[PDB]
């Protein structure tokens, strides 16, 4: 009942004021405040402007508390273990819950890995979005929860998050799919990514390619590939096996896609090996 | 008290330490290289002042003494700034390892208080 | 006033002399300790030799000049 | 929603983060990079300005104020973990004072030991995790004598107002005693692993690996200390060069004023055998 309504009024994270969408189990005392301050580096919450000032004067953290595993001239990625960075990841989950309806903070942050995308500045790395990942997922999900902060939305950051999630799966020699209850906005973004990567792969390959060969090059599960082909009306059934072809539409879609000149993830700048858990 | 647990926890705690040591030490080297190039910048200007004193003494003023003294003081000042950074960096590496070492020594002491560890 | 400045400068030139001597010792001691301790688990390798693995000595650009 | 901009942002976010050529290697926690865990609110600063520093010859700084309160918070949690059972029975300053003296906040004893080992014995052991503003603050033991009792009286009342809980708003954690209330504000429950023990032989083998790992940390700590010493004496050297430079200019000016000749040997550097 209480969780089904917006918990907080307005939040000032860094220089950007954001308006929360859903309930988040912040300290209930903060619900009586007009403004809540969120540190741009530690994601710590504040109801008192004086406590915020004192905190900023003593805080030396200027990036996510973890190793930088990716960096280009646009964004960087940090890998953070929930078990190692309890305080920071709790703050991230509390912040993310404001914009994820079904995010659960029932248990602690230990069983999750947090891949956080930041943009660098004179002041440091500013978090723009992230996606979590189970350390050991039974269903093989490569993404648990994914979020682009509202102040950085509609800038293509959501696409970069999804790209990086598959670049991790490709480096893991595994196929992956986002956790199955996808939000309305989240589903819309994955369908757009799946179409764009499938259309680009088919056109550049220029030869018939098997479903298993597409799944091997993109780390997409066969389920997502088949579903993406059905939407594009390029899937057919012959002799008990699925076949993907090319038509005028795909070649036309590839042209409009390439003209967009979107930022992309450079796999050569990803210095990362999969963590080993005993 | 479980020695296998203590060993597992210690390795997990110290897993990222060798990466941090290399990262900190190569930043110290990067700054020490900047320090050497800045040392030559003032030692050459200081050699000009000293060359003058050897021939004529400290009583005659070097034709560019007032200009060189300001430039040497400036270069000597930014050398102090670079050197402070290396001290800070060196302190972090020492702090990280000492803090990991103290936690391990506490565990070893707790294991010795029982018959678990000899 | 002239005598005071000259006498406290000989002491500071002496301290600079002392700091340079202990600096040279530390440089050598660092190099020797690298040899003793690193020649299973290592701060160099990962806790789980080579002259280029002397990450402590390579932190000094004076040591880099010597080796090159 | 997030179009809006904050105007006081440039006041709260100052400084510069310098990018490094190689990727960042970091694992310190938020607690490591925040400093003193206590932060004054608007009520604390009016008390410090109007009741403590109004006519005082000795000024208590905001930073020093937080040092005292953080020690009070740490001591009470140790001695009275169940303070909420009877908030008005909170210990007095004199009763808590012995615990305050022995308190080791933010690895003070470790930092003090490292400061001693480096041969610095000057300033404080400062890392990448420490802010420059903390330089001015006095030691805790000195603060306990001058301002300990007066500040504790104020902090005692705030602790009573919150019924023995925390002054800063806290997350609601689950309690073992209470049945679940289906409370959406309860979060971050923990569930232990509960793994079976290894065989005794593996315990002995791992006990040997623990001793070997202990030796390697000692070896790395020795190298880390030597590098800290090398940079410490290099800091002493450049501080001498600055002082020597100003002592050479002043002598030359006075020497020219009196027109004295010779004695130039201290005014020029002399080459000597250097490895
Ligand atoms: C695992 C699951 O539960 S999914 C949960 C997903 N996360 C959320 O819903 C939290 C709130 N939303 C967000 O954080 C972000 O919007 C994300 C993560 C969904 C995507 O981030 P964005 O940066 O906004 O997406 P991005 O700008 O990269 O664009 C990707 C696509 O989403 C579409 N899109 C993004 N926002 C909108 C919108 N408000 N309305 C319509 N379409 C949108 C874009 O049109 C784009 O498709 P296109 O190529 O055809 O133009």
Swiss-Prot record, chain A:
Outcome of swapping residue 145 to S: Strongly reduces HAT activity, but is not lethal (in vivo). Lethal
Consequence of substituting residue 94 to A: Strongly reduces HAT activity
Comment, domains: The ESA1-RPD3 motif is common to ESA1 and RPD3 and is required for ESA1 histone acetyl-transferase (HAT) activity and RPD3 histone deacetylase (HDAC) activity.
Protein name as annotated: Histone acetyltransferase ESA1
Active site, UniProt feature: 179
Zn finger limits (C2HC MYST-type): 36-61
UniProt subunit comment: Component of the NuA4 histone acetyltransferase complex composed of at least ACT1, ARP4, EAF3, EAF5, EAF6, EAF7, EPL1, ESA1, SWC4, TRA1, VID21, YAF9 and YNG2. The complex interacts with histones H4 (HHF1 and HHF2), H3 (HHT1 and HHT2) and H2A (HTA1 and HTA2).
GO cellular component: chromatin; NuA4 histone acetyltransferase complex; nucleosome; nucleus; piccolo histone acetyltransferase complex
Function: Catalytic component of the NuA4 histone acetyltransferase (HAT), a multiprotein complex involved in epigenetic transcriptional activation of selected genes principally by acetylation of nucleosomal histones H4, H3, H2B, H2A and H2A variant H2A.Z. Acetylates histone H4 to form H4K5ac, H4K8ac, H4K12ac and H4K16ac, histone H3 to form H3K14ac, histone H2B to form H2BK16ac, histone H2A to form H2AK4ac and H2AK7ac, and histone variant H2A.Z to form H2A.ZK14ac. Acetylation of histones gives a specific tag for epigenetic transcription initiation and elongation.
Site (Important for catalytic activity): 145
Keyword NAD recorded: no
Residues that coordinate or bind acetyl-CoA: 144-148, 153-159, 183
Swiss-Prot record, chain B:
Disulfide bonds: none
Entry coiled-coil feature ranges: 35-86
Domain of life: Eukaryota
Subcellular localization: Nucleus
Family the UniProt entry places it in: Belongs to the ING family.
Domain note: The PHD-type zinc finger mediates the binding to H3K4me3.
Protein role: Component of the NuA4 histone acetyltransferase complex which is involved in transcriptional activation of selected genes principally by acetylation of nucleosomal histone H4 and H2A. The NuA4 complex is also involved in DNA repair. Involved in cell cycle progression and meiosis.
Subunit structure: Interacts with H3K4me3 and to a lesser extent with H3K4me2. Component of the NuA4 histone acetyltransferase complex composed of at least ACT1, ARP4, YAF9, VID21, SWC4, EAF3, EAF5, EAF6, EAF7, EPL1, ESA1, TRA1 and YNG2.
Name listed for the protein in its UniProt record: Chromatin modification-related protein YNG2
Annotated gene: YNG2
Swiss-Prot record, chain C:
Location in or out of the cell: Nucleus
Matching InterPro entries: Eaf6
Chief place of localization: nucleus
This protein's record includes keyword Chloroplast: no
GO biological process: chromatin remodeling; DNA repair; DNA-templated transcription
Keywords, in A-Z order: Chromatin regulator, Coiled coil, DNA damage, DNA repair, Nucleus, Transcription, Transcription regulation
GO cellular component term, pick one: NuA3a histone acetyltransferase complex
Coiled-coil annotated residue ranges, if any: 1-37
Pfam families, per database record: NuA4
Annotated function: Component of the NuA4 histone acetyltransferase complex which is involved in transcriptional activation of selected genes principally by acetylation of nucleosomal histone H4 and H2A. The NuA4 complex is also involved in DNA repair. Component of the NuA3 histone acetyltransferase complex. The NuA3 HAT complex has 2 functionally distinct forms. NuA3a binds H3K4me3, through the PHD finger of YNG1, and acetylates H3K14 at the promoter region of actively transcribed genes to promote transcription initiation.
Subunit structure: Component of the NuA4 histone acetyltransferase complex composed of at least ACT1, ARP4, YAF9, VID21, SWC4, EAF3, EAF5, EAF6, EAF7, EPL1, ESA1, TRA1 and YNG2. Component of the NuA3 histone acetyltransferase (HAT) complex. The NuA3 HAT complex has 2 functionally distinct forms that participate in transcription. The NuA3b HAT complex contains an additional subunit, PDP3.
Family listed: Belongs to the EAF6 family.
Note: Present with 504 molecules/cell in log phase SD medium.
This protein's name: Chromatin modification-related protein EAF6
From Swiss-Prot, chain D:
Role: Component of the NuA4 histone acetyltransferase complex which is involved in transcriptional activation of selected genes principally by acetylation of nucleosomal histone H4 and H2A. The NuA4 complex is also involved in DNA repair. Involved in gene silencing by neighboring heterochromatin, blockage of the silencing spreading along the chromosome, and required for cell cycle progression through G2/M.
The family this protein is said to belong to: Belongs to the enhancer of polycomb family.
Miscellaneous comment text of the record: Present with 1110 molecules/cell in log phase SD medium.
Domain of life: Eukaryota
Segment of the intact protein contained: 125 to 399 of 832
Gene label: EPL1
Origin species: Saccharomyces cerevisiae (strain ATCC 204508 / S288c) (Baker's yeast)
Protein name in UniProt: Enhancer of polycomb-like protein 1
Cellular compartments annotated: Nucleus
Quaternary structure (record): Component of the NuA4 histone acetyltransferase complex composed of at least ACT1, ARP4, YAF9, VID21, SWC4, EAF3, EAF5, EAF6, EAF7, EPL1, ESA1, TRA1 and YNG2.
Coiled coil: none
Classification of source organism: Eukaryota, Fungi, Dikarya, Ascomycota, Saccharomycotina
């Amino acid at each position: 009942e209480v969780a089904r309504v917006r918990n907080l009024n307005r939040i000032i994270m860094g220089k950007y004021e954001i308006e929360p969408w859903y309930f988040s189990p912040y300290p209930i005392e903060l619900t009586d405040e007009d403004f809540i301050y969120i540190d741009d580096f530690t994601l710590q919450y504040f109801g008192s402007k004086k406590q915020y000032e004192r905190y900023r004067k003593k805080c030396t953290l200027r990036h996510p508390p973890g190793n930088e595993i990716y960096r280009d001239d646009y964004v960087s990625f940090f890998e953070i273990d929930g078990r190692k960075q309890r305080t920071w990841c709790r703050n991230l989950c509390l912040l993310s819950k404001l914009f994820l309806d079904h995010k659960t903070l029932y248990y602690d942050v230990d069983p999750f890995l947090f891949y956080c995308m930041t943009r660098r500045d004179e002041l440091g790395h500013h978090l723009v979005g992230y996606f979590s990942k189970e350390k050991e997922s039974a269903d093989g999900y490569n993404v648990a929860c994914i979020l682009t902060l509202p102040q950085y939305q509609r800038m293509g950051y959501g696409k970069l998050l999804i790209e990086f999630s598959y670049e991790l799966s490709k480096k893991e020699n595994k196929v992956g799919s986002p956790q199955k209850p996808l939000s309305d906005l989240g589903l819309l973004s994955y369908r757009a990514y799946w179409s764009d990567t499938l259309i680009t792969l088919l056109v550049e390959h220029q030869k018939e390619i098997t479903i298993d060969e597409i799944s091997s090059m993109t780390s997409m599960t066969t389920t997502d590939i088949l579903h993406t082909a059905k939407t594009l009306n390029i899937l057919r059934y012959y002799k008990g096996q699925h076949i993907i072809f090319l038509n005028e539409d795909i070649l036309d879609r590839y042209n409009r896609l390439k003209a967009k000149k979107r930022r992309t993830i450079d796999p050569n700048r990803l210095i990362w090996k999969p963590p080993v858990f005993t | 008290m479980d020695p296998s647990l203590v060993l597992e926890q210690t390795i997990q705690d110290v897993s990222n330490l060798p990466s941090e040591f290399r990262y900190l030490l190569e930043e110290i080297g990067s700054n020490d290289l900047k320090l050497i190039e800045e040392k030559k910048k003032y030692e050459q200007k200081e050699s000009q002042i000293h060359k003058f004193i050897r021939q004529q003494g400290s009583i005659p003023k070097h034709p560019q003494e007032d200009g060189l003294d300001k430039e040497i003081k400036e270069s000597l000042l930014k050398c102090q700034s670079l050197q402070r950074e290396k001290c800070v960096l060196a302190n972090t590496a020492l702090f990280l390892i000492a803090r990991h070492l103290n936690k391990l020594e506490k565990n070893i002491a707790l294991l010795e208080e029982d018959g678990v560890l000899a | 006033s002239y005598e005071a400045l000259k006498a406290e400068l000989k002491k500071s030139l002496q301290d600079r002399r002392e700091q340079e001597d202990t600096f040279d010792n530390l440089q050598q001691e660092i190099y020797d300790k690298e040899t003793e301790y690193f020649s299973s688990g290592n701060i160099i390798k990962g806790f789980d030799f080579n002259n280029n693995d002397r990450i402590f000595s390579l932190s000094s650009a004076t040591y880099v000049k010597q080796q090159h | 929603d997030a179009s809006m901009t904050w105007n006081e942002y440039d006041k709260f976010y100052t400084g510069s983060f310098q990018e490094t050529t190689s990727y960042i290697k970091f694992s310190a926690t938020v607690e490591d990079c925040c400093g003193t865990n206590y932060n004054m609110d608007e009520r604390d600063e009016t008390f410090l300005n109007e009741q403590v520093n109004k006519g005082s010859s000795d000024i208590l700084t905001e930073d020093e104020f937080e040092i005292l309160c953080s020690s009070f918070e740490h001591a009470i949690h140790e001695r009275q973990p169940f303070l909420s059972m009877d908030p008005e029975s909170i210990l007095s300053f004199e009763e808590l004072k012995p615990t305050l003296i022995k308190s080791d906040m933010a690895d003070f004893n470790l930092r003090n030991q490292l400061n001693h080992e480096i041969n610095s014995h000057k300033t404080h052991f400062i890392t990448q995790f420490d802010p420059v503003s903390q330089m001015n603050t006095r030691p805790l033991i000195q603060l306990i004598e001058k301002f300990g009792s007066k500040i504790y009286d104020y902090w005692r009342e705030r602790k009573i107002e919150v019924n023995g809980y925390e002054i800063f708003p806290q997350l609601k954690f689950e309690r073992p005693g209470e049945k679940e209330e289906i409370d959406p504000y309860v979060c971050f429950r923990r569930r232990e692993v509960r793994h079976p023990r290894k065989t005794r032989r593996i315990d002995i083998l791992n006990s040997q690996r623990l001793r070997a790992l202990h030796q390697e940390l000692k070896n790395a700590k020795d190298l880390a200390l030597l590098v800290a010493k090398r940079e410490n004496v290099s800091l002493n050297w450049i501080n001498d060069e600055l002082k020597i430079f100003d002592q050479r200019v002043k002598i030359k000016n006075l020497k020219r004023s009196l027109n004295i000749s010779g004695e130039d040997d201290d005014l020029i550097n002399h080459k000597r055998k250097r490895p």
